Amino acid sequence: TSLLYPVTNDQRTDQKLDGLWQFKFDEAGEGEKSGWETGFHDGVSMPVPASFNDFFTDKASREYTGDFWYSRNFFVPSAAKGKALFLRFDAVTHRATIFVNGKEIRTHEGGFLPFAADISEAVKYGAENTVVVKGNNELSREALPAGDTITLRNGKKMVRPFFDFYNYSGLNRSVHLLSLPQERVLDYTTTFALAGNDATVNYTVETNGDAPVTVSLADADGQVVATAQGKQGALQVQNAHLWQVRNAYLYTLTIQLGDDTQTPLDTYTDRIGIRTIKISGTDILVNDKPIYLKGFGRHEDSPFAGRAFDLNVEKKDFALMKWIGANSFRTSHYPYDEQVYKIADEEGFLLTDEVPAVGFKMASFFKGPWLKKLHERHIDQIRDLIKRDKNHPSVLAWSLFNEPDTIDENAVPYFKQIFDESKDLDPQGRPRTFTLSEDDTIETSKVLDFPDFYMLNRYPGWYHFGGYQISDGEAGLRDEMDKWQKAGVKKPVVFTEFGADTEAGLHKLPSVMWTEEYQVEVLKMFSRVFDDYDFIKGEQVWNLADFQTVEGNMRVNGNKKGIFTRDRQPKAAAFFYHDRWNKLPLDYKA
Amino acid sequence: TSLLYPVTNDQRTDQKLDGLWQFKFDEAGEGEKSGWETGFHDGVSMPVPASFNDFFTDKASREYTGDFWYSRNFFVPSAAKGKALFLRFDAVTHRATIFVNGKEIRTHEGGFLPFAADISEAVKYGAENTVVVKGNNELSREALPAGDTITLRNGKKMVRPFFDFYNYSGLNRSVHLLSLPQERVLDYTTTFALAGNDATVNYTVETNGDAPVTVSLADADGQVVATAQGKQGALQVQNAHLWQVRNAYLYTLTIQLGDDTQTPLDTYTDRIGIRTIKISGTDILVNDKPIYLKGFGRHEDSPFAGRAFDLNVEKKDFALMKWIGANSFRTSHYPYDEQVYKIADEEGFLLTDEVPAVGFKMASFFKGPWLKKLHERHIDQIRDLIKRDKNHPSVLAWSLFNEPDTIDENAVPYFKQIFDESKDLDPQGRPRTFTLSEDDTIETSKVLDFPDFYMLNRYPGWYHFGGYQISDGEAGLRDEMDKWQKAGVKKPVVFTEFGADTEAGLHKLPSVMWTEEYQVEVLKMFSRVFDDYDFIKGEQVWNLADFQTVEGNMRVNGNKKGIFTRDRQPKAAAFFYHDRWNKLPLDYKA
């Protein structure tokens, strides 16, 4: 109903409820029958935001699957009586029921997009109030991301995902207490055109009343350069400062409700970048010039917060990605905290925004009774993502699956439907795509007509033709690249996963898989291939940093394909890209 | 024809040709047409003994598969004219042709057992002579150990084994220049009986003439305690000092040819231990008392020599195995250098001697036209092994396969034949057995009647039910142990592989697979299981030290299941067994 990010001004308040909540596991499912929805203080303290998994010393807790409970007291100011009061949850992984003062307010499905609860009539204005969250982190084939939940021979419930990353759960992002006007901005949209040194922002504004609307754009020094009235309109910016890759310029948009006579009813402000995105045959055009993508390959994963957003790690990840010459990254495999995009906007990065449609395949999948509810939740999370991130200059494209099983002819109805129901959601109409796994190739894939450009996941030299065989793996990759070229490929091709697990410190001459030298050798190979084909317009290596993963005999304490360690220091492969990427211009191959 | 270890006395000489030979690859197979059999000096220097693989910086050399050539000059003393002259090769992996002064003398199949070439008429007595060895290290399903050789798309030949260890090749063990008498000892045998404080060594002596034979046994201080004449006889030792586990006592045996009147024609001396080995239902009896096996789990693998025997590593491996409380180990997966057994004899360890019958199964095998030649070489290498190691007190049992595919009913003819053709080779008639892989279980194995005791390879908690699932893996292992107990198991059971890859330095609380803590957790689990069943009479963990392996995405620079690092320092699991094994008496479970 509204996913606008909270702001602070005279009409809107926003106060974080971050800190130490109370926490309890509910393996039995008795929490509500036990009166826990009224709040409790007999559990363990738990940080918010943060995944709860890594704070326990026992594996039974770290792996817990089922119903878990967060509880906190908070204060509702007297001054807030009469406004629309909201608890906004930035992410509750994966399922939530919200209670205030013991009263059930709302539920939510999906653990990586924000939701808000209207608590206007459930609080005592001027006193302490209680908020309790009943979360669940089970997996099934009916929810994103896809997986199964099993019971061990000893009764305990355990998750077995269809994806790589670990099942980090809980209150993974901030909780806001909001005060909004009764008549307020709900949504707005931006699209851009260029003409000479002039540009045109084309906006619209969604409201829940009939009061007049007034939009104004100011430059980075605060000077106003365009005004307009009405819920639709066009701002004319003379001699505009365009938003450029690794060279951002952000204008401030200000939406204001109310006619020239009354007290202002609502103010909303955001920062936009004036730039356009077109797929012209086989080029990716930003502001009508061709670009070349270089980057990662990312996860929201840190030692102490787990899946939860941590601003220190994020600014550090960004410091590194600029140092290394990169200009893009894909939010694999789920929407990130909204701060990630604002930094991307300020730093002129291009993001591929991915919905958690991962694990749609087994080691078939589109041939099961789970699709019907799965699809409900899939296209709903697509809608919420595009509604949340629409206005960011830095979002280049939407990714609607990661490694779905496109070999089966039954994937084709489902893709048909997903791609029709998302056709007209993004006002900028940016390209919609998805990643093709190693098994989904020009020869074998059945959904190659759908994407606006191709995103390829290939692992020669790691999952196939490892070691001394790498040369045959390079030859096979060029085989497939020859067949794309033969098939007269007209859309762009971007490599979005490739690489090699590497244990920082393992050295060998000559190399063996898992050493720092082999990783450089593998990345050099992929580079040689990428440079001999013109439809290839981007390299996004997997992965930026070592991230945590389910336990397995192939997981040396998590994934290790990262250019940097989980602590964000470089492996030797860091310096290879630092050399290569800072020498490829932004228009490489044009 | 004779595999006796060389000795030095007035009838027999023995001089090592170890050092730097010349070396060349022969990818083309032109070496003989090019005159290389006459010796060469235009190649690269290569140590002997040692695997050649790890001395090259390029992967193409390290991985080379095909014909390779060793060349050396050596001096034949004038004084040796008239004796039987021999080049004895302790191991040439895997195939050899021997040339002396350009003349082809002999070939050999099998890369882990010694062979001798009679060069009595191919040398110039009193000058320098040339020895050239043409080796090959290809694999096929017709040779032990089993594997395949492939060609890459670029022409290069590459091995793909059916086993784990790396294909270390070349002159992996010493080369001796021998001077033997014209009439000489070829073989001898020992068997033992006990009666009160007295014992009886029952010997026989194989000779290539009719001259009289004279055998005498002396104690550790050099006192003679028994003499006998004739090629068969029985030495009566009063108040014998028995050879005890971790408590050896070795008598010196001296065989002498010639009657009381002539100059001695030949002397041969060896050290034996007076002890007996019986499988009594479900007990393993050494000297009629029950023992409990604890140990490894070994390879001949070191950083600088590769597969080649290195006495420093061997004494260090033995220092550690005594420190840790162990008393046994299995020479997986091939006969070791003969020095390993002499140290075992001096340290009172019990060895399971294994022939390189590994890889008899694919990821079927006994259903192929390769068995006929495979079996030729299999039973021949069995014959050579038992002939070489017969007389060691420390060899407890023979292992005739490692992880053969016993699920197919076609394995049964081949086992039938192998087990009949080895029935009467070991004079002591020690137990013959083999290892059963994870897939070969009480439910599924078709060769359970053959072995004299059962050797089990089980990997719960690693290749199955890893991580948080370990509890279900423990339950499944007890399932199988319950079904053995149900089936009324009458032969002993020994666990001979189990464990977990562990990267020294990886710590986590709670644990994850690959950390030092998880390894201890896994080893504790297996211990709990072993202690609840009486037919279980031994634990040999895999592995003693991290050893090198083929490149693969599951091989973090070789195998890592070792209790010690490849440099022979302890991981945390070292101290767990140091505690446990030094508290289990030698008669645990009796």
Residue numbers in the entry:
A (entry chain A), B (entry chain A): 3 to 365, 376 to 602
Any passages from the paper?
Here we present the crystal structures of the L1 GUS enzymes FpGUS, LrGUS, and RgGUS, as well as the NL Bacteroides dorei (BdGUS), and show that LrGUS and RgGUS exhibit unique active site features not previously seen in L1 GUS enzymes.
Finally, the new L1 LrGUS was a singleton and did not group with any other GUS enzyme. Interestingly, the L1 GUS enzymes LrGUS and RgGUS exhibited much lower kcat values (10.0 s−1 and 2.8 s−1, respectively) than the five other L1 GUS enzymes as well as Km values ~10-fold higher than that of EcGUS. The EDD motif is unique to LrGUS and was not present in the six other L1 GUS enzymes characterized in the study. Site-directed mutagenesis of the EDD motif to the corresponding neutral polar residues QNN led to a complete loss of GUS activity, suggesting that this negatively charged patch is critical for small glucuronide processing by LrGUS.
